[PDB]
Design a protein around this ligand. Structure first.
Ligand SMILES: [Mg+2]
Ligand SMILES: [Mg+2]
Ligand SMILES: [Mg+2]
Ligand SMILES: [Mg+2]
Ligand SMILES: [Mg+2]
Ligand SMILES: [Mg+2]
Ligand SMILES: [Zn+2]
Ligand SMILES: [Zn+2]
Lengths: 49, 43, 273, 180, 49, 440
RNA sequence: UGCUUCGGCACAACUGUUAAAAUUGGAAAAAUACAGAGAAGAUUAGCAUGGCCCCUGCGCAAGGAUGACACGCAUAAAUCGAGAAAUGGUU
RNA sequence: CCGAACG
RNA sequence: GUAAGAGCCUAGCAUUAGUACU
C-alpha cells in the first residue's frame, strides 16, 4: 500500500492524462473512466477535477 | 472526428508573405458604385 | 508598472533610481518572461533585481526580490505555518503552472488578524544588511587583488553549510526551506520551556513584572489555563509565584505563556517556579 | 541534424567571398603581392565567384551576377589586350565586376537579414510548430478534399437527425459514403 | 536599453487551452418526442465493404 | 481600493534637478528631504584665495620653464603607473586544506557464557561429536529452530563450510551475525560496523576469517573467534557480491562485485585491489567460482552471464539471450559442472559448465515460484529456493519440472536458503521479516 | 581653468547586469546493452487527421520510416426484466 | 544554355 | 538489415535571491 501504491497511481494517472490529451475531446467515454478510477482511489479532489 | 480549434514577447520570425504589400486600400470613387453616388439614383 | 517589493528591499533612500528591464528575465517560479527591476537600495548596497513575476509575486504576498512575505518579512513557510493553511496545491510542473496561470487570467492574505506568532518572530528594524554586496570569492580563496576597492564584501562566508543552497521554488512555495526551518526550530526551543524532572512542582514563576500590574491582574492572566492554587506577589523582585492544582494546567500556562507574553504591556518572563 | 539551409550557406559563401577579397588585400599589404597582382587578383575574384565560392547553390538567381560578370570580363579583356598586351593574367580592371557584386549585396542584405533573423529566432525561441496554418498544396489537395468532404457530410448528418436520435451512427454513414 | 544584437531571449512554452468562459443555460423548447417509428427510420444498417 | 498591490503608485512630474538633488542629499549624505513634503529624513553621518593663487603660481611657474626650440622631447618615466585581515583568511585557508584532504569503529558483542570450551578450544573449532548423517539428502519435514535476533529482515545466511554446525547471516539491521545450529541454537556473538544494512556473506575456507560487504560501500573482513576487524576496503562503490577463491592457496584474496559493473579482486593481505575486471555493462549482482577457483562466472544487470578466468582481465565468454532475465543469485551445483541462475522471470535455469564447455540446459529448468539464494542438496537430488510469499520450494533432480516440496516458511520475502552440508534433511531458511527458520 | 571688488565666484555632478568568481543546478552527445518499424497474406508509394511530440529548413515550401505517436488490447457487463409459479404466511 | 538541397 | 527510441555511468548551460536570538 505505501509508495508502491503511490507509483502505480503515478503510472495510471499518466496513462489517463495521455489518453485524455489524445482522445479526450473528440470521443466521450474516457473522463468517466478517469473519474471513476480517481473515485476508486478515494481521491475526490482529483475526481472532481 | 474533431478538427483543431483555432483560438488565438511576440515571435520575431518574419514570413515572406507577410512583408508589406498593397499597403493602401482602394475606395470606390465617383463612378465605381460609391455609396453617396448610389443613393442619388433609382436602381 | 512598479515592483511588488519588501520595503526593506528599497533601502533607506526615499528616492529610488531603478532600472526597468522589460522582458529582462524568467520568473524563478513560473519560468515566465517578465519585466525585471534592478536597483541599489542604498549606498552600502548592491544592485538587487526582482526574481519573480509580478503575479507570482502578489499570489503569495511576497516581495519580488527577497521572496519573503510582504506583511511580516518571514519566509513563506513561517507565514504558512502561522497561517495554519494547507500545503501548496499549485502545480510544480511548468506545463501545470502555466496552465493554472492561463486559467486564472481569463476569469486570503489581507483579511487575517495580525498573528502574534509572526509578529513575535519578526525583525523590528529592516534587515538592510540583506541589501549588501556578496562576499568576495577571491578573498575567500585568499587570491583577491582588488584590495579594499572590491565592490564585494571582504569577509569570509560565515553560513550554515546545509544553507547556502536555497531553492527559489522552495522558498516561494514553502517546502524544505532551511532558513524557515532554522527559524521554526528556534521557536520550537523557545516554545520549549523545560518542564522539569520534578513532576509535582505545580508553580510558575512570573518575573520582570512592572509594578502597575497587580496580583489579580496576573490572576486574570493565568486563570484561563487552569485552576490556581495560590498567586503570590512580590514587587521588590517585580516577580510572582503562581501555583495550580493540576500539573497539566501549569503545563498549559508554560506552553502558551513561555514565548514571552505581555500582560497589559509589560514585557514579562515565565519560568518553572 | 547537421544539414544547414540556404541562409547559413549563403551567409558563409558571402563571407568566403569577403575573405577572398580581404585576403587579396592582405597579401598586397604583407608585401607578397604587387599592386598589379592585387588588382588582377581582385578582378579575378570578382569574375570567378562561381568558381571560387559556390554561392550560386544557395541562391541560384545570382547566376545573373555571374553571367553579367562573364560578359563584363569578355568586354574588358577584349578591350584591354588590344595591341601587344596579350592573353593572360594582368588585367586588373575590377571596378565593373566589383560593382556587380555590390549590387547583389545591397539587394540581398534585406533578404539575408530576414533569413538569418528567422534562423536565429528558431534557434532562440524554438520552432513555432503549434497551430500555424498549413497551406493546401498540391500534395494535400486530395486528402484535404476528403477532410472537407467528410466534415460537410458530418454537418449534414448532425442536422438531419431528429432531436432524440443517438448522434453516433454518423460513423457508419461515413462508411456508407466511402462505400458508395 | 536592450542590445540590438541580443537574440530572442525566451523560448516559447506549450500549454493546453484552458476551460474557456463558463457555460451558458441551454434555453431550449420542450423535447420533441421521438416516435419509435422515427427511431427506426434512422436505424442505419452497418456498412459491409 | 488601493492602486498598485502593496500600496498606491501615482505618477509624478518634477524638473529633473529635483529628483537628483534630493536623491543625492540623502543618497550620499545620509540625510535628505522627504519626497512627501514632510520635513527631512534620517540622520547625518571648497576652494580658496591663497590656494587658488598658489595653483596659479604653479601654472605660471610651468610657464616660466625655459623652452629649447632645438631640443626634442623625451619620455622619462614612460609608464610608471603600469609596472605597479590576512590572519583569519590564513586560518580559513588552513581549514580549506583540512576539509580538502579529509575530502580526499566496527565491534563485537559476545553472547555466549565463555568464548572457549573446556580444552582451550575456540567455539568455531568444529565439534568431533557430529558426523555425516546419510549419503543421500532428504526433504524438509518440520520446524526445528527459528534463528531470531535480527531487528529487521536479513540478507542471507550461509553454513560454515565442511561441518555446518553454525551459520553466519548478514542483515538489513546493519550487522553480521553468527548462530549455532547443533547445540544451543544461540547467537554466539554479534559483529557490527556497517553504516547501513550488510549486503551478503561469504566465509573463509576454514572459518577463521569472515568478509562482509555493506550498503555503506565498505567491505570489512573480520575474525570469527576473536571478533576483531582485520581490514575494511572501500572505494565509493555499492557492493553486492563477496567471495574468496575456493582454493586454499589464495584464500587471502577475495572477490567484490560493485554496481559500478566492476569486479575488484581484492587482497585481504595487502589491502589494495589486486585486480580489476571492468568487462561488465550493468550492475554487479552475483558471482560464483567454478573449476576449483579457476573460473568465475559473473551476473550482470545488462542481463549477461560472463565466465572469466582468475587473472584474465579479458572476459572469457559472455552469454546474454533475448529471453535472459536478471540474475541476482548464482548457485554452484555440487558436481562443479552446473550452475543455477535465478532469472527475474520467476525461474531457476540450470546451466551446464563442464571443462569450459558451458551450455544452456534448457530442459532441466525449475519454475512455478515467484534475490533468493538457491540451495543445493549435498548429494544433488534437491534444489531449494525462496519465493515471494515466504515459500521455500524444493525440486527433485531428475524432475526439475515436478514440484516436490512446497514449504510455507516465512511471512514475507524469503531470500536466504541453504541445505545443511552435514545434515540430510535439515535446511536453513531466512526471510525479510527478521525471521529465520530451521527445517528438519 | 577663466573671472576676479583677489573674499571668493563660476564651471563640471553619481560608472558598474557591479567577478579576475563562487557555487549552482541542468543538459545534448558517446559507448554499452536493450531492443529495433504503417495498412490487409507478403512486399511495398504515399497524402493526411489529432497535439503539453518534435527535428531539418528562410519557410504559409519541402522533408524527417506515410517523422514519430495514437490506432483499441474494444477481459470499453454497451445489461435486465417478464412471468409463472409456486411458495410462503395467514386465516 | 550552364547548379545545389530534399525526397 | 533499417534506424527510432527508454535507460545507465560519466557526462559545462543558465542563475544573483536568500543566511536573524531577552
Ligand atoms: Mg502524410
Ligand atoms: Mg512530412
Ligand atoms: Mg520509403
Ligand atoms: Mg505524419
Ligand atoms: Mg512527398
Ligand atoms: Mg520518404
Ligand atoms: Zn524585498
Ligand atoms: Zn575582493
Amino acid at each position: 500500500d505505501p509508495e508502491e501504491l503511490a507509483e502505480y497511481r503515478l503510472s495510471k494517472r499518466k496513462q489517463f492524462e495521455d489518453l485524455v490529451r489524445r482522445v479526450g475531446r473528440f470521443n466521450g467515454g474516457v473522463w468517466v473512466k478517469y473519474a471513476t478510477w480517481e473515485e476508486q482511489q478515494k481521491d475526490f479532489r482529483r475526481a472532481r477535477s | 472526428w474533431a478538427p483543431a480549434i483555432g483560438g488565438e514577447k511576440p515571435s520575431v520570425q518574419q514570413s515572406a508573405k507577410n512583408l508589406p504589400g498593397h499597403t493602401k486600400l482602394k475606395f470606390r470613387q465617383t463612378g465605381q458604385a460609391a455609396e453617396e453616388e448610389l443613393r442619388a439614383k433609382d436602381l | 508598472d512598479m515592483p511588488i517589493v519588501c520595503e526593506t528591499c528599497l533601502g533607506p533612500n526615499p528616492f529610488v533610481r531603478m532600472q526597468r528591464i522589460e522582458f529582462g528575465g524568467t520568473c524563478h517560479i513560473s519560468g515566465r518572461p517578465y519585466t525585471v527591476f534592478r536597483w541599489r537600495p542604498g549606498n552600502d548596497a548592491r544592485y538587487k533585481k526582482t526574481v519573480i513575476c509580478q503575479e507570482v509575486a502578489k499570489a503569495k504576498n511576497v516581495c519580488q526580490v527577497c521572496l519573503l512575505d510582504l506583511e511580516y518579512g518571514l519566509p513563506v513557510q513561517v507565514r504558512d505555518a502561522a497561517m495554519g493553511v494547507k500545503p501548496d496545491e499549485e502545480p510544480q510542473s511548468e506545463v501545470g503552472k502555466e496552465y493554472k496561470l492561463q486559467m486564472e487570467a481569463d476569469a486570503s492574505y489581507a483579511a487575517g488578524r495580525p498573528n502574534e506568532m509572526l509578529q513575535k518572530l519578526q525583525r523590528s528594524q529592516p534587515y538592510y544588511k540583506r541589501n549588501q554586496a556578496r562576499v568576495c570569492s577571491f578573498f575567500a580563496k585568499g587570491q583577491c587583488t582588488r584590495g579594499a576597492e572590491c565592490p564585494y564584501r571582504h569577509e569570509l562566508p560565515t553560513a550554515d553549510p546545509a544553507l547556502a543552497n536555497q531553492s527559489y521554488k522552495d522558498r516561494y512555495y514553502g517546502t524544505n526551506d532551511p532558513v524557515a526551518a532554522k527559524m521554526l526550530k528556534r521557536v520550537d526551543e523557545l516554545n520549549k520551556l523545560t518542564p522539569p524532572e520534578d513532576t509535582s512542582i505545580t508553580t510558575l514563576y512570573v518575573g520582570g513584572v512592572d509594578a502597575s500590574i497587580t496580583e489579580d491582574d496576573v490572576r486574570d492572566a493565568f486563570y484561563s489555563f487552569g485552576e490556581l492554587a495560590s498567586v503570590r506577589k512580590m514587587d521588590v523582585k517585580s516577580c510572582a509565584f503562581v501555583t495550580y492544582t493540576t500539573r497539566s494546567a501549569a503545563e498549559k500556562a508554560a506552553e502558551e505563556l513561555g514565548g514571552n507574553p505581555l500582560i497589559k504591556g509589560a514585557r514579562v518572563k515565565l519560568m518553572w517556579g | 541534424k547537421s544539414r544547414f539551409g540556404n541562409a547559413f550557406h549563403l551567409c558563409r559563401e558571402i563571407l568566403r567571398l569577403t575573405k577572398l577579397v580581404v585576403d587579396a588585400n592582405v597579401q598586397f599589404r604583407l608585401g607578397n603581392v604587387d599592386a598589379y597582382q592585387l588588382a588582377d587578383g581582385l578582378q579575378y575574384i570578382f569574375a570567378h565567384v562561381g568558381q571560387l565560392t559556390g554561392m550560386y547553390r544557395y541562391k541560384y538567381r545570382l547566376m545573373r551576377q555571374i553571367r553579367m560578370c562573364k560578359d563584363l570580363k569578355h568586354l574588358i579583356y577584349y578591350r584591354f589586350n588590344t595591341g601587344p598586351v596579350g592573353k593572360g593574367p594582368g588585367v586588373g580592371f575590377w571596378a565593373p565586376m566589383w560593382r556587380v557584386w555590390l549590387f547583389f549585396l545591397r539587394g540581398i542584405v534585406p533578404l539575408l537579414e530576414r533569413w538569418l533573423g528567422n534562423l536565429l529566432a528558431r534557434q532562440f525561441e524554438g520552432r513555432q510548430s503549434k497551430g500555424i496554418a498549413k497551406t493546401v498544396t498540391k500534395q494535400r489537395i486530395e486528402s484535404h478534399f476528403d477532410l472537407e468532404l467528410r466534415a460537410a457530410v458530418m454537418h449534414d448528418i448532425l442536422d438531419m437527425m431528429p432531436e432524440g436520435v443517438k448522434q453516433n451512427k454518423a460513423r457508419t454513414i461515413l462508411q456508407h459514403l466511402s462505400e458508395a | 536599453p536592450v542590445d540590438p544584437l541580443e537574440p530572442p531571449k525566451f523560448r516559447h512554452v506549450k500549454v493546453p487551452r484552458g476551460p474557456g468562459s463558463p457555460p451558458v443555460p441551454v434555453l431550449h423548447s420542450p423535447p420533441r418526442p421521438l416516435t419509435v417509428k422515427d427511431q427506426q427510420d434512422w436505424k442505419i444498417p452497418p456498412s459491409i465493404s | 481600493l488601493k492602486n498598485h498591490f502593496v500600496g498606491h503608485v501615482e505618477d509624478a512630474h518634477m524638473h529633473p534637478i529635483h529628483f537628483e538633488q534630493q536623491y543625492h542629499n540623502f543618497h550620499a549624505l545620509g540625510f535628505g528631504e522627504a519626497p512627501s513634503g514632510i520635513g527631512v529624513v534620517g540622520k547625518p553621518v571648497r576652494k580658496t584665495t591663497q590656494e587658488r593663487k598658489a595653483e596659479q603660481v604653479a601654472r605660471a611657474e610651468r610657464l616660466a620653464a625655459p623652452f629649447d626650440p632645438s631640443a626634442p622631447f623625451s619620455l622619462q618615466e614612460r609608464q610608471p603607473w603600469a609596472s605597479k585581515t590576512e590572519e583569519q583568511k590564513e586560518f580559513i585557508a588552513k581549514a580549506e586544506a583540512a576539509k580538502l584532504e579529509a575530502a580526499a569503529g566496527p565491534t563485537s558483542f559476545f553472547h555466549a557464557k565463555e568464548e572457549k570450551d573446556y580444552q582451550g578450544r575456540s567455539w568455531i573449532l568444529p565439534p568431533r561429536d557430529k558426523k555425516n548423517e546419510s549419503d543421500s539428502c532428504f526433504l524438509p519435514k518440520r520446524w526445528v529452530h527459528t534463528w531470531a535476533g535480527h531487528t529487521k529482515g536479513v540478507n542471507a545466511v550461509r553454513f560454515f563450510p565442511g561441518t555446518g554446525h553454525l551459520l553466519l547471516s548478514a542483515g538489513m539491521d546493519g550487522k553480521v551475525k553468527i548462530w549455532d545450529v547443533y547445540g544451543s541454537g544461540k547467537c554466539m556473538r554479534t559483529y557490527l560496523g556497517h553504516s547501513k544494512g550488510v549486503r551478503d556473506v561469504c566465509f573463509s575456507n576454514d572459518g577463521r576469517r569472515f568478509l562482509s560487504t555493506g550498503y555503506d560501500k565498505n567491505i570489512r573482513l573480520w575474525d570469527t573467534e576473536t571478533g576483531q576487524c582485520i581490514k575494511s576496503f572501500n572505494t565509493g562503490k555499492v557492493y553486492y557480491c563477496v567471495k574468496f577463491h575456493p582454493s586454499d592457496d589464495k584464500q587471502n584474496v577475495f572477490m567484490s562485485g560493485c554496481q559500478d559493473k566492476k569486479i575488484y579482486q581484492f587482497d585481504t593481505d595487502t589491502g589494495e585491489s589486486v585486480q580489476e575486471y571492468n568487462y561488465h555493462l550493468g550492475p554487479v549482482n552475483s558471482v560464483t567460482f567454478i573449476d576449483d577457483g579457476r573460473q568465475f562466472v559473473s551476473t550482470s544487470d545488462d542481463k549477461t552471464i560472463r565466465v572469466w578466468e582468475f587473472g584474465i582481465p579479458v572476459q572469457i565468454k559472455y552469454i546474454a539471450d533475448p529471453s535472459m532475465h536478471s540474475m541476482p543469485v548464482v548457485a554452484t551445483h555440487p558436481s562443479k559442472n552446473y550452475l543455477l541462475m535465478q532469472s527475474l522471470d520467476n525461474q531457476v535455469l540450470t546451466y551446464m559448465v563442464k571443462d569450459g564447455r558451458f551450455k544452456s540446459m534448457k530442459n532441466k529448468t525449475f519454475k512455478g515460484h515467484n534475490a533468493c539464494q538457491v540451495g543445493c542438496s549435498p548429494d544433488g537430488k534437491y534444489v531449494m529456493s525462496g519465493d515471494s510469499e515466504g515459500r521455500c520450494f524444493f525440486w527433485e533432480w531428475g524432475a526439475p519440472q515436478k514440484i516436490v516440496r512446497t514449504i510455507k516458511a516465512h511471512d514475507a520475502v524469503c531470500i536466504g536458503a541453504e541445505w545443511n552440508p552435514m545434515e540430510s534433511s535439515k535446511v536453513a531458511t531466512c526471510g525479510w521479516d527478521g525471521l529465520i527458520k530451521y527445517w528438519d
